[PDB]
Amino acid sequence: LLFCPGCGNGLIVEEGQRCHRFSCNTCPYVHNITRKVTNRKYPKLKEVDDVLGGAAAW
C-alpha cells in the first residue's frame, strides 16, 4: 500500500511503462528500474517431535 501525494487513494500499478497511475487524477510516478521489494517473510514449518512414550504411566 503506497499512497498518493495529492489525493491519497492507494497503490495501483499500470503495467504500461512502469507507472503508478491511480484511479483518480493522474500522478503516475514512472519508477525507473528501481527494484520493488516486498518480502513479507512467512513462517517456516518447524520439524517435528516423536510424541514419545516417556510418560503415559501415571
Residues near other proteins (CB under 8 A) are 3, 5-8, 19, 21, 24-30, 49-52
Closest CA to 7 of 31, 29, 23: 23
Q: Indicate the DSSP class of residue 46.
A: -
The beta strands (E) that lie in the chain are given as none
Residue 24 CB, nearest approach to other proteins (Å): 8
Nearer to Zn ion, 8 or 54 (CB): 8
Residue 13 as a binder of Zn ion (CB under 5 A): the answer is no
Cell of 40: 513479507
Number of chain positions touching Zn ion (CB under 5 A): 5
